[PDB]
Amino acid sequence: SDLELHPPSYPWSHRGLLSSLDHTSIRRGFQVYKQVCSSCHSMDYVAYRHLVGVCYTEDEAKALAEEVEVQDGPNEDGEMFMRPGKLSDYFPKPYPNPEAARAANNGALPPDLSYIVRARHGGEDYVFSLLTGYCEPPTGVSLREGLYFNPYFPGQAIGMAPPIYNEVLEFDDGTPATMSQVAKDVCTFLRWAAEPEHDHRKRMGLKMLLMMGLLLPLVYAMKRHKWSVLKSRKLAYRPPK
Amino acid sequence: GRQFGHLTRVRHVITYSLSPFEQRAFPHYFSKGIPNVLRRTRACILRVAPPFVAFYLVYTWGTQEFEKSKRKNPA
Amino acid sequence: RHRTKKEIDQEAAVEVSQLRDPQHDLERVKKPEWVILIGVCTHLGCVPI
Amino acid sequence: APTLTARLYSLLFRRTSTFALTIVVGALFFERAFDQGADAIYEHINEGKLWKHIKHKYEN
Amino acid sequence: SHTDIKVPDFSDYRRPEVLDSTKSSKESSEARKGFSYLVTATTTVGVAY
Amino acid sequence: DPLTTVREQCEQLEKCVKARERLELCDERVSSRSQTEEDCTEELLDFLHARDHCVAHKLFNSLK
Amino acid sequence: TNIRKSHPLMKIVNNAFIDLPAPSNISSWWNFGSLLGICLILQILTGLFLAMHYTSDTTTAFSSVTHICRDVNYGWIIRYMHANGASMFFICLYMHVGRGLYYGSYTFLETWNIGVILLLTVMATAFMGYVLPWGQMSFWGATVITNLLSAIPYIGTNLVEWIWGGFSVDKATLTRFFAFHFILPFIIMAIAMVHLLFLHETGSNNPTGISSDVDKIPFHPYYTIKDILGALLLILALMLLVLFAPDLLGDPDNYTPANPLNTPPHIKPEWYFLFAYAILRSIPNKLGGVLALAFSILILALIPLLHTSKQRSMMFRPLSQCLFWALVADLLTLTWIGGQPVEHPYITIGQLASVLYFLLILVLMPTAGTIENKLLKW
Amino acid sequence: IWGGFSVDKATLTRFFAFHFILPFIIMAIAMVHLLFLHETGSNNPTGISSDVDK
Amino acid sequence: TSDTTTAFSSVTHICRDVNYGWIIRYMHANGASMFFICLYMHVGRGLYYGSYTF
Ligand code: HEM
Ligand code: HEM
Ligand code: HEM
């Protein structure tokens, strides 16, 4: 407790002012979400239609939604049935309550992962450092072992076991699925989940700066034109005698 | 509400003016401009700068002290 | 809050005269092992750790 | 041998009507040319967008 | 005595087209209004965008 | 897994060596008596600070 | 006769924006009034378009804000234009007040005193808005500010429970705050018109603090084009915030939904409230702290009575200039201490900066003006 | 104006926002109304100028 | 509140649960009618008395 360590600056393909997300790295990172995180983590604000622009086709995302059963509201009996899964439906919920989340995870609540990048200082750098930074405790420090050592988590005792050295995932393009690379892809995706506007924001950003680079000197030249009359005026005082 | 014609009394002042179409929008813009900003900086530095440096010194001390307070060395 | 004997001994030992809001511990609790509180600071309403 | 500024004035800028007509024709043609360039600059900077999407389409 | 009122030299501030006292300004008024109105035209296009 | 390659190469660098040893002289200190309060949190966090800094500069060239 | 001059509506526009005699010599620092007006209309337009999609229930407030940013076409730019527009509003407010202080523009008693009301009204406005997305900082910020009223002797508890509509910040509080936050910028707009009316009795002050009746120019074209340039510089600074750093001034805890059971460990205001926050927690007493906080804003209404110099402006006053810049740097120090934990160096220096704030204004600047008078044999 | 294919979620919230703003716009147009009136003053039952008996 | 799920319920909440919410609600509903009664009398006055010459 009390003492803290703060994350380093990793050079993401999306860090710099005009730099978009790697969408191939978004694609891989969804797969990390589906395979690993979704069993414990809610993502209440991303639906299957959101992927269609970004990392999949319309047909692909329909098929990924088809993998899960949903629950739809009733027919004539007043019933609640289960449903093959669509595109309008949100990412599926592991738990009905927060209390059910706490009951599975020995008292600790796994937080929703929709905004987790924007909800922590450091953003993706913190999450990467949390994932790749699991180590042995130092001498002096004993845990519960219900709680686990991480130097990046405040207090040092995280209720999350390392979810990461497990070498998982169907890969399609088929890049190597190392602990470093699996963390790189998930963080790239979790940025997108926090900020879908990221790519549009920066395209607009370029368009702004280019326009302002035109418009600022031109409006300046307009104000200089009108003000010329005054800035070059000569006064003379000519009193009698 | 104040209006032209009713402001004040002025006697014996000639103003000479040129059209903006007759003249430069940026006359001697760097060659006269940068000497002027240099002269303006000199005129004000001794009034503006010394409070902010005194903030910076209290900033850098205060951050250094707090960081170094959050450490032991014997128990 | 379930109270250890060390804590109940310690709160009996506090000088009542020296405090901002002067109460003995005995007038605050119905039975001395159980202290029950509204978990809201009297300053500006933050929740104390 | 008269200037292009002089011609742009004489033909287009003198009447406020034609001046406004110049800007609006100017704005339509500018919107096309600016967007086309500013997309292509942003596109050349980036290259992991749906540059990739040859992979996953056309199979359908 | 009002005849002692010469207008002071504006050569410092004058556009290069209108420095020659023996040249008609009429010859350059089209080019000069052209330049300043092109500025305002280009601006309005940019602002419209 | 190229994190292992990079952390090994980072530990080579001069600031990390002096922080490993300051941790080592804390490891030895805290074994040595029956009842102590002292922690070695401060000494470890010191080292990973120097180590993960160098990690961040280098790691992402490997990752595809 | 012109149409512009004698048409009963166009009359008002004429006397405010066209034919208004203005000082030839007003600087950059006079741009902030029009910029504050721009800021108000920006907050109005983006805010209405947010109100078209936002719902004000505890169950749905966070979700509706999320809905704006993912699902509503261009809801993200409107949302971020609004959040950063609020910051732009306070940047312009502070530059404008500071201009008034330095240049003796506060000698326009009624104009100044309405500006104070304008400041207290935008402060109340931006507080109630920040609550609305129902993040963690929204909630605990709501908790801390509302509880400032509970320090008032005898009636204080009854007053806070009344503004809650309950025993804490809850359902009744959020909906309230939406309604009050909608109405108050229209009230601001009306008080801003009254502000401008009082100003037009005298016209503008200038850098020199000397009467400029001898050298007035028409507002149009000169300050119409100068204000246009000013607005485009405001748009640059706003768009830099929205399109390149949208979370820079935001607290990350506001991206976590409101929890009524658990505080954040830190708890800090938005940047523009950090000086006042530093002043409050400088006092080891409940009532003392809030009284200090209230007095830190309300002191501006006493600044007219503490004018002591025979010159209006600080332009010809090197002593006062040094003490003014000492105030600005004291305020920078207070904004630093505001944003930091209540621990070792920060407490005592926060106390010293708080003393110095009140020492500069109440004592030191009115002593400098008197010395400067004596120095000029005046 | 729906924000959709019928009167729905988007429509109601819209209508709350527009219904809040419009009476303040009304209040401003009512001031402009009263300004125009004060140029002439009031008409009367007779429709004859009442300058003689104000 | 201005959601489809809660709009009817919040109006109901005003009329049962909110202290004097019923008078405020009904003052509003009937005030709207009063507004139109006054609008129509006012327009009709204008028509009859030639006040439209302004
Ligand atoms: C999959 C690689 C994965 C990611 C990514 C991940 C993220 C993550 C974050 C960022 C936290 C928040 C830490 C904080 O509060 O600052 C966190 C928290 C917990 N998680 Fe997790 N999580 C990943 C996957 C998994 C899996 C597979 C499990 C179950 C083994 C798991 C569980 C938890 C728990 C419990 C926590 C709460 C920790 C605490 O505060 O004590 N997560 N997750
Ligand atoms: C709602 C935000 C406000 C708006 C819209 C606004 C409006 C403006 C406008 C348009 C001007 C004229 C141009 C200029 O000098 O800037 C001005 C001048 C003035 N304002 Fe404000 N104002 C506001 C806030 C304030 C505040 C907070 C104060 C200080 C308590 C202030 C005090 C004055 C004074 C004294 C002047 C006269 C300046 C002078 O001529 O030197 N105003 N106001
Ligand atoms: C009458 C016009 C206004 C309306 C209708 C309005 C409405 C809104 C709404 C609906 C929200 C909630 C959505 C959101 O958080 O993004 C909001 C939040 C906000 N309002 Fe306003 N607003 C108005 C003007 C104001 C003004 C004048 C200010 C003060 C500069 C202000 C400051 C803000 C702030 C700080 C927030 C929080 C933004 C955030 O971080 O999410 N708004 N307002």
Ligand code: HEM
């Ligand atoms: C927002 C609702 C309105 C308000 C607050 C209002 C305000 C008033 C006021 C205060 C008067 C002066 C006293 C009187 O003669 O009644 C008046 C007169 C007048 N109003 Fe309105 N009015 C409104 C609606 C209308 C409408 C709908 C019209 C017709 C299209 C109307 C046309 C006039 C005219 C012509 C007069 C001159 C009457 C005369 O002197 O005989 N007003 N208005």
Ligand SMILES: C[C@@]1(c2ccc(F)cc2F)OC(=O)N(Nc2ccccc2)C1=O
């Ligand atoms: C935006 C803000 C604020 C704006 C204007 C104001 F005058 C006071 C405020 F607290 O509203 C709010 O809840 N916080 N946050 C906050 C307030 C007190 C303690 C901690 C955070 C603000 O900074």
Ligand code: FES
């Ligand atoms: S000490 Fe301020 S709220 Fe607890």
